[PDB]
Write an enzyme that holds these catalytic residues in place. Sequence first.
Site, mmCIF file in Angstrom:
data_model
loop_
_atom_site.group_PDB
_atom_site.id
_atom_site.type_symbol
_atom_site.label_atom_id
_atom_site.label_comp_id
_atom_site.label_asym_id
_atom_site.label_seq_id
_atom_site.Cartn_x
_atom_site.Cartn_y
_atom_site.Cartn_z
ATOM 1 N N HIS A 95 0.814 -1.210 0.000
ATOM 2 C CA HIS A 95 0.000 0.000 0.000
ATOM 3 C C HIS A 95 0.853 1.268 0.000
ATOM 4 O O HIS A 95 0.357 2.363 -0.273
ATOM 5 C CB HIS A 95 -0.983 -0.007 1.186
ATOM 6 C CG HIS A 95 -0.458 0.623 2.440
ATOM 7 N ND1 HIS A 95 -0.064 -0.116 3.535
ATOM 8 C CD2 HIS A 95 -0.337 1.922 2.802
ATOM 9 C CE1 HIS A 95 0.272 0.700 4.519
ATOM 10 N NE2 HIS A 95 0.114 1.943 4.100
ATOM 11 N N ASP A 126 -0.958 -7.139 2.246
ATOM 12 C CA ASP A 126 -0.201 -5.903 2.215
ATOM 13 C C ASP A 126 1.283 -6.221 2.381
ATOM 14 O O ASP A 126 1.858 -6.062 3.465
ATOM 15 C CB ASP A 126 -0.681 -4.981 3.339
ATOM 16 C CG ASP A 126 -0.243 -3.549 3.143
ATOM 17 O OD1 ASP A 126 0.200 -3.215 2.021
ATOM 18 O OD2 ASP A 126 -0.343 -2.759 4.110
ATOM 19 N N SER A 171 4.433 2.534 8.210
ATOM 20 C CA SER A 171 4.041 1.402 7.363
ATOM 21 C C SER A 171 5.200 0.855 6.533
ATOM 22 O O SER A 171 6.086 1.597 6.123
ATOM 23 C CB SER A 171 2.892 1.803 6.428
ATOM 24 O OG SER A 171 1.650 1.767 7.113
ATOM 25 N N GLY A 222 3.660 6.908 8.350
ATOM 26 C CA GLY A 222 5.046 6.868 7.915
ATOM 27 C C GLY A 222 5.775 5.618 8.379
ATOM 28 O O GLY A 222 6.851 5.296 7.881
HETATM 29 C C1 LIG Z 1 1.574 6.973 -0.246
HETATM 30 N N1 LIG Z 1 2.503 7.073 0.911
HETATM 31 C C2 LIG Z 1 3.841 7.668 0.650
HETATM 32 C C3 LIG Z 1 2.162 6.577 2.160
HETATM 33 C C4 LIG Z 1 3.103 6.609 3.247
HETATM 34 C C5 LIG Z 1 2.783 6.056 4.507
HETATM 35 C C6 LIG Z 1 1.519 5.451 4.728
HETATM 36 C C7 LIG Z 1 1.232 4.774 6.097
HETATM 37 O O1 LIG Z 1 0.339 3.895 6.148
HETATM 38 O O2 LIG Z 1 1.928 5.113 7.085
HETATM 39 C C8 LIG Z 1 0.551 5.420 3.656
HETATM 40 O O3 LIG Z 1 -0.631 4.716 3.794
HETATM 41 C C9 LIG Z 1 -1.661 5.338 4.472
HETATM 42 N N2 LIG Z 1 -1.429 6.422 5.283
HETATM 43 C C10 LIG Z 1 -2.402 6.973 6.061
HETATM 44 O O4 LIG Z 1 -2.081 8.016 6.926
HETATM 45 C C11 LIG Z 1 -1.906 7.667 8.272
HETATM 46 C C12 LIG Z 1 -2.280 8.618 9.263
HETATM 47 C C13 LIG Z 1 -2.215 8.283 10.640
HETATM 48 C C14 LIG Z 1 -1.777 6.992 11.044
HETATM 49 C C15 LIG Z 1 -1.386 6.008 10.075
HETATM 50 C C16 LIG Z 1 -0.924 4.710 10.484
HETATM 51 C C17 LIG Z 1 0.080 4.012 9.731
HETATM 52 C C18 LIG Z 1 0.519 2.717 10.128
HETATM 53 C C19 LIG Z 1 -0.037 2.098 11.280
HETATM 54 C C20 LIG Z 1 -1.033 2.770 12.037
HETATM 55 C C21 LIG Z 1 -1.640 2.092 13.272
HETATM 56 N N3 LIG Z 1 -1.264 2.841 14.479
HETATM 57 C C22 LIG Z 1 -1.476 4.068 11.644
HETATM 58 C C23 LIG Z 1 -1.451 6.360 8.686
HETATM 59 C C24 LIG Z 1 -3.710 6.427 6.046
HETATM 60 F F1 LIG Z 1 -4.639 6.955 6.861
HETATM 61 C C25 LIG Z 1 -4.003 5.298 5.211
HETATM 62 N N4 LIG Z 1 -5.247 4.696 5.224
HETATM 63 C C26 LIG Z 1 -6.555 5.384 5.465
HETATM 64 C C27 LIG Z 1 -7.534 4.495 4.707
HETATM 65 C C28 LIG Z 1 -7.036 3.114 5.135
HETATM 66 N N5 LIG Z 1 -7.648 1.979 4.326
HETATM 67 C C29 LIG Z 1 -7.365 2.043 2.856
HETATM 68 C C30 LIG Z 1 -7.219 0.651 4.828
HETATM 69 C C31 LIG Z 1 -5.500 3.244 4.989
HETATM 70 C C32 LIG Z 1 -2.937 4.761 4.412
HETATM 71 F F2 LIG Z 1 -3.120 3.690 3.617
HETATM 72 C C33 LIG Z 1 0.878 5.982 2.393
#
Ligand SMILES: CN(C)c1ccc(C(=O)O)c(Oc2nc(Oc3cccc(-c4cccc(CN)c4)c3)c(F)c(N3CC[C@@H](N(C)C)C3)c2F)c1
Length: 245
Positions: free
Chosen positions: A46, A97, A198, A196
């Site tokens: 993702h 994922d 993830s 960030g």
């Molecule tokens: C494109 N780029 C560069 C990135 C970089 C990092 C992230 C990340 O996940 O950290 C990312 O993915 C995502 N990033 C988000 O922003 C955030 C905001 C606050 C917390 C988190 C967050 C990330 C990982 C674990 C946890 C659990 N504590 C929380 C992610 C999302 F809300 C989603 N959703 C919101 C909708 C939900 N759904 C589709 C499952 C997923 C997402 F998929 C994209």
Amino acid sequence: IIGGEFTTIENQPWFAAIYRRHRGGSVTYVCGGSLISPCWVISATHCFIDYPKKEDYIVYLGRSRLNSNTQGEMKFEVENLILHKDYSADTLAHHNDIALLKIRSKEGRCAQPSRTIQTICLPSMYNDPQFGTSCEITGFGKENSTDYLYPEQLKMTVVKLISHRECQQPHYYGSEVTTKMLCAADPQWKTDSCQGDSGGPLVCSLQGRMTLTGIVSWGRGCALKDKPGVYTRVSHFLPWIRSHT
Ligand SMILES: CN(C)c1ccc(C(=O)O)c(Oc2nc(Oc3cccc(-c4cccc(CN)c4)c3)c(F)c(N3CC[C@@H](N(C)C)C3)c2F)c1
């Protein structure tokens, strides 16, 4: 990472920092990852699904800081970005994922071992620690909701594994978590993965050897009561990893 402490890559030598390149030479951080073999970094699909072009990404190993250099760091390009073909997302969860990045330095070599660069071991099939076990997570993700900046120094924290039956309870995530996921949280809900983080590793020390048990995937908020972090359960993708590697 919310809560937790600053750490150095020396303490997390398998951690990989993944950025996206931009015209001019500037980059933006994307996600974390883990080195599982000299040529392969594992992360979350993702992180890339919106911009699946391998040419746009760079990977650092041996890197302790987000926007400055660390002695001994290695920079890589992505030769092959492999996303899971059955990746999907509903309203809460990511499914399947997991992503593989084949890495290659400018000079064409894979990763070389050092004090700041090491592989993590993969788990055995269907073999994971019992709930209650402490494991660590690492990342450059946000440490505070009001921050506009990510931490400049790598962070880590310790969370505990939550049973599948607990996480599937209605006031947790219900049927949203499958057997291909694992949940982990602080018992006091004070520390957690966040935006960030993830792609990064959930690591548990098994018989002394550090093992890649999960990959940071999703949750609800950061450090919210009754909302554990949810990770891809690596021990259930060993065939996929083995075959694509
Ligand atoms: C494109 N780029 C560069 C990135 C970089 C990092 C992230 C990340 O996940 O950290 C990312 O993915 C995502 N990033 C988000 O922003 C955030 C905001 C606050 C917390 C988190 C967050 C990330 C990982 C674990 C946890 C659990 N504590 C929380 C992610 C999302 F809300 C989603 N959703 C919101 C909708 C939900 N759904 C589709 C499952 C997923 C997402 F998929 C994209």
